[PDB]
Design a protein around this ligand. Structure first.
Ligand code: A1H9V
Ligand code: A1H9V
Lengths: 262, 265
């Protein structure tokens, strides 16, 4: 992996592994999501980050994902090489955005694209706050200043409603194991993708390919929490999703998926 | 990755990823186990398998893991490059063995080693059978003929007998269910998920103050996609040892048994 010539974006190549593929011998959406996180982390490292800036560490501030949107045209096959380009952009005082472009290394064609919105919050109180000018001049030097959108047109900005009971489908009692946690003992965001997809019926997974997924992150699931995954068909096939705590029903995530017939 | 010069073993390098590490910023045992599987799969592909031979595919036969033994001296850090060498050996008509050696690419020192015993089984009936001459002659050309053991020692931990944990267990984690990410390309539960499930009943305080040095797992039965498992652990012991058992949540049918050895950080 390396920063591009202008130092305003980062590229990395990955060879798809045997345990990273599903029944179609192609990478799952969770493997793609993991690769997006890995390339984002390598970009932050290459430009001297933790991605907390120097003023953020003093103030105990962190970037947290508010929304993630992924669109896949072709899932790479086991053994294929995928190239991913990522970059960040400031969204004024609202927060920041990280975008990605996925390409087949052999053909050079765009096989997927993703976008994510991040907000600043105090690490301890979990309270959101606007982006200060001091904590903006430090990260703007690593971002392109003219607009550069992975989704210029679109589905990434759609409003997501709250699923109403009764749900058409459900998977209950979902619990994270130690492998679902990151280096800071927080549940990895890719686990929420898996949990959302668990309530899609197996027949849909067997006859369709996931083309679009949009997730809004509302609250974190702790290590000792138990989650219920709820899905209702809103339609290609479209679904409305909701993850909530198994007991009191407190919302953790909401989302939408769009699936195409194979 | 590539076969070595003699074509009797295979090496591959991996750079440890951010999501592959735990609290110490080092690879978890599940990441190591995943890498062992990946290098084994690349070795079979390099020598023409897909690891069923031509006679095996004709008779609906497959290799299945009976026992897995891993010993880790140093877990690689996030960003470190680890080199893994793997090879197979015939164990007469009993079955086959796949061994691995893990090294730090920078220092060249052995940071870990693993061994696994595989048995031949009919894919549909799940009935075991001894290795015939026709199958043996097809895979022996890809194996070193003189002994090559990752665990040579005459009284090593890889060959120890594992007893069945007796109720009541000291610790337990109940209601464990596999999700779609725990399945392989053939919709079977990945063996690395059983490692995770075994480790779930180790108390968090032990995980926080110790590093896992050795893990031995005996595979008895496969967990289906709609099965629910209970993970049971009892301390048997500067070092801590545990006896483990995974069984079906309902009738208590055994799926796996194992042992772990942990050392103080
Ligand atoms: C791709 N998603 C899983 S995400 O946008 O939540 C993300 C990206 N880097 N870290 C989290
Ligand atoms: C390392 N283990 C998880 S294993 O020995 O069960 C194995 C190795 N390749 N496939 C399974």
């Amino acid at each position: 992996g390396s920063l591009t010539e202008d130092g305003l974006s980062y590229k990395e190549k990955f060879v798809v592994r045997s345990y990273e593929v599903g029944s179609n011998k192609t990478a799952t959406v969770e493997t793609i999501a993991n690769l997006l996180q890995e390339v984002g982390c390598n970009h932050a490292q290459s430009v001297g980050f933790s991605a907390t800036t120097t003023t953020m560490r003093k103030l105990h501030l962190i970037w947290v994902t508010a929304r993630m949107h992924i669109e896949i045209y072709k899932y790479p096959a086991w053994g294929d090489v995928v190239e991913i380009e990522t970059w960040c952009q400031s969204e004024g005082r609202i927060g920041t955005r990280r975008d990605w472009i996925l390409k087949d290394s052999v053909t050079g064609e765009v096989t997927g694209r993703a976008t994510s919105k991040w907000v600043m919050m105090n690490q301890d109180t979990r309270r959101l706050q606007k982006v200060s000018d001091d904590v903006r001049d430090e990260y703007l030097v690593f971002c392109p200043q003219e607009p550069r959108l992975a989704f210029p047109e679109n589905r990434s900005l759609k409003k997501i409603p709250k699923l109403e009971d009764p749900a058409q489908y459900s998977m209950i009692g979902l619990k994270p194991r130690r492998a679902d946690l990151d280096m800071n003992q927080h549940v990895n965001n890719v686990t929420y993708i898996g949990w959302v997809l668990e309530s899609i019926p197996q027949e849909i997974v067997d006859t369709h390919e996931l083309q679009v997924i949009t997730l809004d992150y509302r609250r974190e699931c702790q290590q000792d929490d138990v989650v219920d995954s709820l899905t209702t068909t809103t339609s290609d096939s479209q679904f409305l999703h909701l993850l909530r705590l198994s007991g009191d029903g407190q919302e953790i995530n909401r989302g939408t998926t769009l699936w195409r017939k194979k």
